[PDB]
Each structure stands twice: as structure tokens, then as C-alpha cells.
Amino acid sequence: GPQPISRLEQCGINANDVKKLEEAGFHTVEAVAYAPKKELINIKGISEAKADKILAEAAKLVPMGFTTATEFHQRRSEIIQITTGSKELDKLLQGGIETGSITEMFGEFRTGKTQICHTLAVTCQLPIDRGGGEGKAMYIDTEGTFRPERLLAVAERYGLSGSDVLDNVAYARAFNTDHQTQLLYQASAMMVESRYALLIVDSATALYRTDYSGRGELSARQMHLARFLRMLLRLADEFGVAVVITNQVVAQVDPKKPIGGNIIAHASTTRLYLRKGRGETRICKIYDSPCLPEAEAMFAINADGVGDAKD
Amino acid sequence: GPQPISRLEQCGINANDVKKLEEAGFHTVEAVAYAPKKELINIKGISEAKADKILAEAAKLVPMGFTTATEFHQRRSEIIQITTGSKELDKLLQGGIETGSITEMFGEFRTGKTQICHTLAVTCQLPIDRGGGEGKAMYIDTEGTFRPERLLAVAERYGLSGSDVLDNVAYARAFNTDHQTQLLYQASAMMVESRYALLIVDSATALYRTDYSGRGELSARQMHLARFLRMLLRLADEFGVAVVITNQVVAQVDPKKPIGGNIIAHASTTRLYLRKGRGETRICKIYDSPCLPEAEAMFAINADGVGDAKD
Amino acid sequence: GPQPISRLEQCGINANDVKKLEEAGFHTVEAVAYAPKKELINIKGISEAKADKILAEAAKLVPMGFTTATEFHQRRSEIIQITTGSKELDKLLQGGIETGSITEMFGEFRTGKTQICHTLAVTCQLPIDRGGGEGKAMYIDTEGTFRPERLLAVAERYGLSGSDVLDNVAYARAFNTDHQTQLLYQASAMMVESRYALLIVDSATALYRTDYSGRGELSARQMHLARFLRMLLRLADEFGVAVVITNQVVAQVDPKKPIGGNIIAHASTTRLYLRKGRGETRICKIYDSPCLPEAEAMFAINADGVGDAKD
Amino acid sequence: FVSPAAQKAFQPPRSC
Amino acid sequence: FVSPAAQKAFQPPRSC
Amino acid sequence: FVSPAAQKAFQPPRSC
DNA sequence: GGAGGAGGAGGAGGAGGAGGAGGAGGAGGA
Ligand SMILES: Nc1ncnc2c1ncn2[C@@H]1O[C@H](COP(=O)(O)OP(=O)(O)OP(=O)(O)O)[C@@H](O)[C@H]1O
Ligand SMILES: Nc1ncnc2c1ncn2[C@@H]1O[C@H](COP(=O)(O)OP(=O)(O)OP(=O)(O)O)[C@@H](O)[C@H]1O
Ligand SMILES: Nc1ncnc2c1ncn2[C@@H]1O[C@H](COP(=O)(O)OP(=O)(O)OP(=O)(O)O)[C@@H](O)[C@H]1O
Ligand SMILES: [Ca+2]
Ligand SMILES: [Ca+2]
Ligand SMILES: [Ca+2]
Ligand SMILES: [Ca+2]
Ligand SMILES: [Ca+2]
Ligand SMILES: [Ca+2]
């Protein structure tokens, strides 16, 4: 896990300053090391010289230099991939939902964006031997469509204590885009105290469509969304969680486009396009990824979460 | 290759001063010769008179005067062009990615900016006879989308030792724009010790969009980016590497514009615009170049990196 | 042509002093006559009385008094205008690039600043009957984007020996702003030995944007640029060459502004604003001139340099 | 605020 | 910092 | 420094 | 032998970024 920011006191930082770094949202040594000098200057008590020392000492506790692709290939071969509860879907992702990265699932209505998030919320608690991440689940919800009964269904499938599964899912409802970003700062505080494997924002863009309604609010909208996505990457690098955001679609005027513009498209490393199949079956397509080929799969929404097409 | 800065000691420079030039980021005689008098005065121990002597002696070891277009045409006819792994793409570039210069590739998501960088990271290690540069690869990554498994795929295509290919790619992840520039100073130290053919920053502008969010931070943003690009030109002139940066796009309000403003546009000598074709095929267009006509090509992203359209 | 500074020895100047004027950058009688008394006092061996004599004798060899607009209109009607390789562009300039003056071309990227400079570098060698200047070309380059292959293309269009054309283009690369000014002093030495028709600085302002990064370095930046432009005027008056500098642009916050401030705007007599047209066509606008009306033209970048719009 | 049950550490879900 | 494997010089990739 | 080919005087480019 | 005093003079710009939004029936025959 990451190093708590208290470890800066054993390096020459006044504990009164570590407390000021705490109110700014920094709870780990990594979060302070990854931060720019500019970000620390914006804090009240921190001066130019303090940030230089705080960054210098943080730099010693976490490596921020060059390595070889060999060492990076070795370290990545040990990365956790949480199972999607579907063999055919896990094979498409070559293991499952990859941690330390932002995965985005978009599609029409009913295509299973909320249903995959409820399956992932449980299967992240499974032992790694069974395809999990052995961590808690954080579910930021912006639509009100979080159903704990859908978690209990997935728990029964994997034979887990439904009461214990509901104890490892931290749930927050976001009511606007300012709140949605505010909830991520509290997320950083919690992820130090307990081990989390997966973070879910559902939907990451739903509230942006109506908080910034105007024509001239477009730049301010994409800028605020860019900061939210930048903060999700922070949590993914800091704690190694798997960030899974969902996205809504739109119609092509000149046939389904995800909303959020180029900001959401450049930021997400894996983009999953979900279509409606027949009955309860759905089709997941690799829409963008650094390592996976543009392919398709066929999963299903069953009475016990997302599984393989039962036919 | 370039001359190590130690050669200044055999010319009248106190080895205690060469050490001070070392902490300022100068490791070659060329880097000191190309530097302004102003840049050396900003160093602590260096005085006005020392910089005059240091510059005078550096001037003798590297030519900084006039020549003829004949001599320059002869010297340029011997310049290395690294293959893009695609015949149709190499023909568009009239040889491949040209060294000693800054090449920029921009486009929408999925259009192959990271995939070309992973192909270039391998094919730069090929012998010049096969279209390579016979040097190591440096991959500064600001998004987290560096996949060594995509390098092993390109290695198999060219029948190279995947273990040896991963040993010639130096990888660093940048977490903010200050770190991104800091990594270039360490790059200058490494490029003296070993032979590098290619430097990759992917993406060179992704972090600038959110480190400088404000409206009044725009000048400070483009100024910090201008210094980063000025330092990339330094490495390209000092070591003769091929600098390949990537860029993200934006929507036209009044249809895809690269971000970074006029700073990135004036600085990059070759600009490559990548579009999405059909299936796995992509379209690369010459967007700006001093010598290449505004034309197009059609490459593809295959299971073994960037290649020609397989159809 | 101008008179070599050796002609001062036949007028009462000790040849040991003419040698001291040589190290200060004076190689012609005109350069010494146009110089202030203050500039000669700053030389080591020269005293107050010597400079008085040196200036008095130089004053006799070159006319520095009043004439009539008639005599000046007659002398100007014999001035050389180098062709831009485009009929529509030459008509906008009423003849071409006018010698003995500073012409500045600015615009966005790709708009043809480097391409016009490569066409001008060849067409300055044409006989005056064909629209040239019958002189060599000097190309100070601060970006690294000098392509001798683009000269050979323009040579074929005018049916000139490509080998001989590359022998008449003196090329120097500037790495910082101090070097850029230093190269102009060597330019003054060369322009006495051989006949030059055109001097090109591309770009004259690119390096100033990053050599003087700070907020408080702004005055020192514009002062150093003012001296460089003052020295370009010196070469234009001394040798009668056509000085063509290029400039980069910037965005308007409150739509494209040339950089360099009021210094570059007051100093350049003709300012050419280049826009991007359609395909390979560009639009050149008279942005400032003492004699030309504010008009526009449409040229094109072709496989043989700058020419007329082929359509 | 932080729920007193959300502050608790991850407990491995038992078998049922 | 510099990785001890990144400090090593360029070795020509063998054939496989 | 001055290139020995740049010190040479302007030669009229021949026809090709 | 002795016995101080007199201010003044401005200047120098630069920097882009940002998508999104469906919809609409019809037409007998051997
Ligand atoms: N217990 C269940 N058993 C079977 N199918 C179910 C069950 N619960 C929901 N579904 C089905 O799953 C789909 C709902 O998917 P989901 O909640 O993920 O939607 P979504 O993609 O988030 O949509 P939206 O954009 O409207 O929020 C519907 O087809 C619904 O009938
Ligand atoms: N092994 C593979 N085989 C085939 N196609 C692949 C493979 N890996 C990735 N791709 C495809 O390559 C594309 C990804 O391109 P790349 O990683 O270069 O994106 P990018 O241009 O950097 O995008 P972004 O702005 O999102 O970072 C996708 O279309 C993906 O499906
Ligand atoms: N041989 C050629 N044939 C046709 N077009 C060409 C050729 N070489 C370059 N071009 C085009 O000319 C343009 C490049 O112009 P140029 O080199 O003058 O740029 P610039 O104005 O100096 O830009 P920057 O500010 O980036 O340096 C591009 O549109 C490029 O495609
Ligand atoms: Ca939903
Ligand atoms: Ca992406
Ligand atoms: Ca990428
Ligand atoms: Ca450019
Ligand atoms: Ca140029
Ligand atoms: Ca003017």
C-alpha cells in the first residue's frame, strides 16, 4: 500500500505543516510527491521554501525516476484484474478490469452499465485466487440507481456473506458536479484507512450535461470534467484501485456517441461500448485500449448480476 | 556522438567548475556551447568571467559558424530515419521519423498515437540497414498507457529478442508538468552514458491542460510548455535523437484542433494528423513539415504494432 | 558595393588602429561613418581624439548630408527587388522583396514562412533581368528547419545548377539569442569579401521567447532584440542586402498577434501576414509598409517552392 | 462525513 | 534515480 | 569560423 | 592662512480552448 503522509514528520517536516497538507487533500507521501510545486504554494500556510523541502523529502520516499521496460513489465505482470463475472467478458479484457487505470463503459440505456458496476462491486472483494482484488468497493452514484439487492444477488452466486459484502461497499450519492468532485477528496482519506480495490463513478458525466447547460459554459464544463478525471487518475496511481466510470450516449446527427468530448476519450485508457443484444444478452466491444484488440464479446444480465450468456 | 563535458578540463576549466556545470544540467561540450551566457551566470559558483572563459573554450570544441548549403546537404544526406513499421507510412515521411528534430503526432482517441510510439520504441533498436537507429529508446509517459507487451509484439515481427528489446527502452512516468521537465534533465545525463536513438513524450501536452486550469494561467502554461519544447530541441541537437511527442485534440466551436496553441505548432517541425479509418486502419496526414508535401497515407494497428493496411 | 575599411589607411589612420576597428566589427568605411562617437570610444585602443579623426575621415568618404527628394527618388528607382517566385505575390509587393530594408513575415504554423525563405534564398541568385539580385544568400536559422532539398526544388524550376545554387547559400544555425547576434558580426565580415543580396533570419524572435522567460526579463528581452534589429538595419544600409526576418504569432486573449512587441513592429518597414488558405494555397496580406496599400494576395506552396496558386 | 461502518477495514467476506 | 539496468549501454537486440 | 566554400565569391548559377 | 558646493534620468508584452442532439407510417386482393 501507499505510505501515510505522517511519514513526512520523520524526515524534517513540521507536524503542523503535515496537518495543512491534510486539509488540502494529501494523505499519502505519494500524493504529495506526485503533486506540483504550484499545488502546494496554493495552500495557505505553505510557503515557497516549505514546498521545496516537502517535495524534496517526498521525492526520496517514492521513486520518480527512470527504470527499464523489463522492470516495468515485471511489475505489471503482478497487477490485479478484477473479474467481470463473465468468462466471455473476462477473455475480452484478457483477465478482467485492470487496476491502476481508468476504465469507461458507455452505451444506451439498459445495456448494463449499472449492472456491471454492481457485479464489480462484489467480485472486487473476492480473493485474488478467485479473480478478485481483496479490497473494498467505493460506489459514487450520481443517478440514484444503486441497488444493494443486486449486490446480494451477486454474492449468493459466489457464495459470500451478503451481510459482509454490504459492509465492504462504501456508498455515496452525488447531487451535482461540485459534490461529485468533493466526494473524491473524502475518498482519498478513506483509502488510506482501509484497503479498497475498486472505485465506481456511475455516471461520471450524467450531471455535467445539466450543471453546464449553456453554449458558453462548454469550456468550463470540459475543464471541470478534466479536473475530475485528473483526480481519478491520482487515486488510481496513489492507491492502485481500479477506477470504473460509466458514460451516457448521444445520437449522431450526420449511431451512438459517448458524451464528454475529447476530454473523456483521451483520459480513459479502456473504453467499453455496450450494445443491446437479444433478451437478456448484451454485447461488449473494446472501443479503445492500449493493449487489447478491437474485439467483441457477449455477456448477459442474469438474476445474479452479470454472467455469461445462458443459452 | 557528443563530447563529454569532462573535455573542458583539458582546456583550462577547473574541474570544480565542470562539476557545477553538471548540477545545472550540462553534461556535454555542445550543451555548454549552445547555452547562453545568461544561463551560466544563473549558476551559483559561476561568475561573469568564468562563463566567458567556459563559453570561449566550448566554442573551440564545437563549430558554431557559417558553412555552405553544400556541406549541410551532404551532412543531412547521412541522417538516420527510423522506420514506422509501415511501408505506406514510411513513404509518406520519405524514409521514416527523422532524427535531430521534433515530430508531433496528434489526433482523436484510439487513432494510434500510443501505438506508433510503441512501434517506434522497438524499430529504433534495429540496425540502420533494416531502417532503425541502432540506439536505445526513451519513453516519457504522462498517461500511464505504456504497455511493454505491445513492444514484445513488435519485436516478434522483426524477430528480435523480446528480453533484449525491453532492456533498451528506458521508461519514466511523469505525474505533472514540473516532473515532466525534470525528467528531461535526467535524460541528458543518460544520453551521454548510452546511445539513444529516439525520445518519446506521450503525451507532451496532456498534463498542461489540468496543471494550469485557470483563465489567467494561460500565459504561464504556454511559457512552461515553451521551455519544455525548447529543452527537447536541445536534446535533439545535442545527441541527435529523434524526438516524437504526441498531442491531444479539441473540438472546433465555429473539426479537430491540436491543443498547445501556437507554441507547439511553431516548435514542431513535422506534425502528423491521425484519423480513424475503417476497422483497424488509420489515416496519417502531413499537417506541417519543412520538406514533405501535404499528403496522406493509410496504415493499420495490427496485433504486432503499426504496420501496413492488411487487406 | 561598400568601401573596405582598409581605405582609411590612405587617409591618415594608423593601420594598427584599422585592425582595432576590425575586432570591433567594422569592416567598411560606411560602418565606421554610421557609427556613433560613443561606439568607437568603447574600443580599447581607440581614444577620444582617434575616434574624432576616424569619424572625420570616414565622413569624407561617404556622404552623410542633405540631398533632394529628386536625387533620392532617382537613386531609389534603381533599387533591386527580389522576386518571390509568385506573380500574384510580386504584384502585391510591387516588384518583390525590396533590398536595403527589413521585411518581416509572420503567421501561424505551416503558413509558409520557411518556404518563402527557401524560395527567396534561390531567386536572389537569379540575374536582375529575371527578377533576382545577383548575390549570395545568407540564412541564419534558429529552428533547425533549413532544408537544402527545398532549394534544389526551386532551382530546377528556374533551371539553375543545383550544385551552384547550394554554393551561394551561406548557412548558420543559431542556438541562442547571444549566438544569433554574434552571427551577425561574422555576417558583416563575409559581406565584404563576397556579394550578398539577401539575409534571412528564421526565426528572428523564436529564441527570445525562451531565453528571457521571466516576467522581469521583459525589458532586457526587448532591449536585446532592439539591438539585433538595429544591427540588421546596419547590414541593410552598409551592403544593401534585403533583410527578411520571420516571426511567430500568439493568440489574442480579448485573432493572431505577432510576437516581439512594439520593438519588432516599429523596426520592420514591411510586415507580411500569412494565413492558411485551402489545400496548398496561402494568403499574404500587407500588414505594414511605407508605400504599399493594405491589400492581399494568394500564393501557394508547391513541390518547387513558393509559386502562384495552381488551379 | 464518514460512516462508522465505512471507516472499518476490509473484512474478507465469509462463505455462505 | 537511474535504474541499474537503464545505465547499461545499448546492446544490439539478437535474433529470435 | 568561415567555411572555405563560403569565403568564395558569388558565382552566377549556370543553366541546367 | 584660509575656505564649500551642486542633481538627475524611463522603460517593456504576451497567451488558447471547448461538443453535442433524434425522429417518422403505410398499404389490398382474388
Ligand atoms: N434482477 C434482474 N434480473 C434480470 N435483469 C435485470 C435485473 N435487474 C435489472 N435487469 C435488467 O438490466 C437492465 C438494466 O441495466 P442497468 O441498470 O445497468 O442500466 P444502465 O445501462 O445503467 O442504464 P441507464 O442509462 O438507464 O442508467 C435492464 O434490461 C433490466 O431489465
Ligand atoms: N494488440 C492490439 N491489436 C490490435 N489493435 C490494438 C491492440 N492494442 C490496441 N489496439 C487498438 O489501438 C487503438 C489504441 O491506440 P492508442 O493506444 O495509440 O491510442 P491513442 O491515440 O494514444 O489514444 P488516447 O488519446 O486515448 O490516449 C485502439 O483502436 C485499440 O483497439
Ligand atoms: N515539398 C513540399 N511540397 C509541398 N508542400 C510542402 C513541401 N514542403 C513543405 N510543404 C508544406 O509547406 C508548409 C510548411 O511551411 P513552412 O515550412 O514555411 O512553415 P512555417 O511557416 O515556417 O512554420 P513554423 O512556424 O512551424 O516553423 C506545410 O503546409 C507543408 O505541408
Ligand atoms: Ca444506470
Ligand atoms: Ca483514451
Ligand atoms: Ca494514449
Ligand atoms: Ca512547426
Ligand atoms: Ca519554420
Ligand atoms: Ca514598421
What whole-number distance in Å separates Cα of residue C176 and Cα of residue B233?
Answer: 12
Nearest CA among A21, A51, A20, A53 for reference residue A36 = A51
Does C129 lie at the interface with F, CB-CB under 8 angstroms?
Answer: no
Alpha-carbon dihedral sign for residues A277, A281, A283, A284: positive
Contact (Cβ atoms closer than 8 angstroms) between residue C245 and residue C263: no
- In three-state secondary structure terms, C226 is helix
Tell me how the structure was determined: cryo-EM
Strands B242-247 and B102-107: parallel
C69 and C85 share a domain?
no
Total number of residues shown for chain D? 16
Task: Identify the residue whose cell numbers are 539575409.
Answer: C199
The string over B177-188, giving b where at least 16 C-beta atoms fall within 10 Å of a residue's C-beta and e elsewhere, is: bbbbebbbebbb
* B119 shares a domain with B5: no
Distance from CA of C186 to the nearest CA of F (A): 8
- Distances from the Cα of B148 to the Cα of A87, B85, B105, C132, angstroms: 25, 17, 20, 56
Residues A29 and A151 in one domain: no
Whole-angstrom distance, CA of residue B211 vs CA of residue B172: 19
Cα angle at C51 between C46 and C54, to 5 degrees? Answer: 115
Are residues B135 and B268 both part of a single domain? yes
Q: Determine phi and psi for A33, rounding to 5 degrees.
A: -65, -45
Q: The cell 541502432 sits on which residue?
A: B134
Strand ranges inside C87-202, DSSP E? 97-98, 102-107, 136-141, 169-173, 196-202
Helix (H) or strand (E) holding C288: strand C281-288
Contacts of C36 (CB under 8 A, 6+ apart): none
Cα separation, F6 vs C12, whole angstroms:
33
- The domain that holds B186 is classified in CATH as 3.40.50.300
Query: Looking at B73, B97, B128, which one is the last position of a domain?
Result: B73
Q: How many domains does chain B have?
A: 2
Query: Is there a single domain that holds both residue B117 and residue B188?
Result: yes
Q: How far is the CA of B148 from the C1' of G16 (A)?
A: 35
Give the three-state DSSP class for B179: helix
Give the C-alpha separation, A249 to C167, whole Å: 62
Instruction: Please tell me the total number of residues recorded for chain B in this structure.
Output: 311
d(CA B143, CA A53): 27
**Cα–Cα–Cα angle for A211, A216, A219, rounded to 5 degrees:** 75
Looking at ligand 2, which atom is closest to the CA of residue B248? 25
Interhelix angle A48-61/A15-23, nearest 10 degrees: 90
Q: How many CA atoms lie within 13 A of B143 on its CB side?
A: 29
C-alpha–C-alpha distance, residues B179 and B174, integer Å: 6
Q: Do B212 and B221 contact (CB within 8 A), yes or no?
A: yes
Ligand in closest contact with the CA of A145: 4
- What would the grid cell of residue A83 be? 473479474
Are C91 and C45 within one domain?
Answer: no
For C261-291, b where at least 16 C-beta lie within 10 A, e where not — what string? eebbeebbbbbbbbbebeebbbbbebbebee
Does the beta-carbon distance from B190 to E7 stay under 8 Å?
A: yes
Q: Please check whether residues C42 and C170 belong to one and the same domain.
A: no
Which positions ≥6 away from C93 have C-beta within 8 Å?
C81, C84, C270, C292
Backbone angles phi, psi at A81, to 5 degrees: -125, 115
**B161: chain A residues, CB-CB within 8 Å:** none
* φ, ψ of residue A170 in degrees (nearest 5): -85, 125
Tell the residue number behind the cell numbers 493496411, with chain if given: B309
Using the Cα atoms of residue C39, residue C140, residue C294 and residue C96 in order, give the sign of their dihedral.
Answer: positive
Test F6 with B63 for CB contact under 8 angstroms. no
Q: Which residue of B has its CA nearest to A234?
A: B175
Set of cell numbers at residue C268: 520592420
Residues with CB under 6 A from ligand 3: B 265-266, 286, 288-294; C 109-115, 143, 145, 248, 280, 301, 303
Q: DSSP secondary structure string, A93-140?
A: TTSSEESSSEEEEEESTTSSHHHHHHHHHHHTSS-GGGT--SSEEEEE
Q: How many CA atoms does the CB half-sphere of A80 hold within 13 Å?
A: 26
Cβ neighbours of residue C255 under 8 Å, at least 6 residues apart?
none
Helix or strand run (H / E) with residue B305: strand B305-308
Domain edge (last residue) among A50, A73, A96:
A73
> Sign of torsion, CA B245 B300 A70 A270?
positive
Nearest to C200 by CA among B69, B25, B88, B283: B69
Question: Which residues in chain A have their CB less than 8 angstroms from residue E13's CB?
Answer: none
Residue B168 and residue E5: Cα distance in Å, rounded?
A: 9
- Nucleic strand G under 7 Å from the C-beta of A231: no
Residues forming beta bridges with residue A6, ordered by sequence position: none
Q: Has C114 been labeled as part of a binding site?
A: yes
* B173 and B121 fall within a common domain: yes
- Count of Cβ atoms closer than 10 Å to residue A303 Cβ: 11
Q: Which residues contact C2 (CB under 8 A, 6 or more apart)?
A: C28, C29, C30, C31, C192, C238, C239
Q: Are residues B240 and B111 part of one domain?
A: yes
In whole angstroms, give the CA distance from residue C21 to residue C8. Answer: 11
Hey, what's the cell of B71? 556541406
**Within 10 A of A42 (CB to CB), how many other CB atoms are there?**
10
Task: With residue B59 as reference, give the H or E element that holds it.
Answer: helix B48-61
C-alpha cell at C60: 569624407
Q: In C, which residues are within 8 Å of F2 by CB distance?
A: 186, 189-190
H helical segments located in chain A:
15-23, 29-33, 37-41, 48-61, 69-76, 87-92, 113-123, 148-157, 162-166, 177-193, 208-211, 218-239, 261-267
**What amino acid is encoded at C182 in this protein?**
Q
The candidate with the shortest Cα–Cα distance to B219, out of C274, C265, C259, C276, is C259
Distance from residue A147's CA to nucleotide G24's C1', rounded to whole Å: 36
The secondary structure of chain C in percent helix, strand, coil, rounded to multiples of 5, reads 45, 25, 35
C305: nearest Cα among C172, C158, C165, C203: C158
How far: A301 CA to G27 C1' (Å)? 40
Residue closest to G12, CA→C1'?
A: C219
Same domain, yes or no: A62 and A6: yes
Check which CATH number belongs to the domain holding C55 and give it. Answer: 1.10.150.20
B208: helix, coil or strand?
helix
Residue B211 CB in 7 A reach of strand G: no
Q: Are residues B48 and B121 in the same domain?
A: no
Closest CA to A302 of A119, A139, A109: A119
The C-alpha atoms of residue C200 and residue C150 are separated, in whole angstroms, by: 15
DSSP-derived pairing of the beta strands A102-107 and A97-98: unpaired
Q: Cell triple for residue A301?
A: 444480465
Cis omega (within 30 of 0) for bond into B203: yes
Range of the domain at B282: 74-311
Cα separation, B150 vs B307, whole angstroms: 13
The owner of cell 510576437 is C259
Alpha-carbon distance values, A117 to A82, A84, A146, A269, C89 (Å): 12, 9, 9, 18, 63
Residue where a domain terminates, one of A73, A89, A114? A73
- What is the SS3 assignment for B67? strand
The CA distance from F1 to the nearest CA of chain B, in Å, is 5
* Residue C196 in contact with partner chain F when CB distance is under 8 A: yes
Shared-domain flag, residues C104 and C149: yes
DSSP codes joined into one string, C195-212? -EEEEEEETSSTTHHHHS
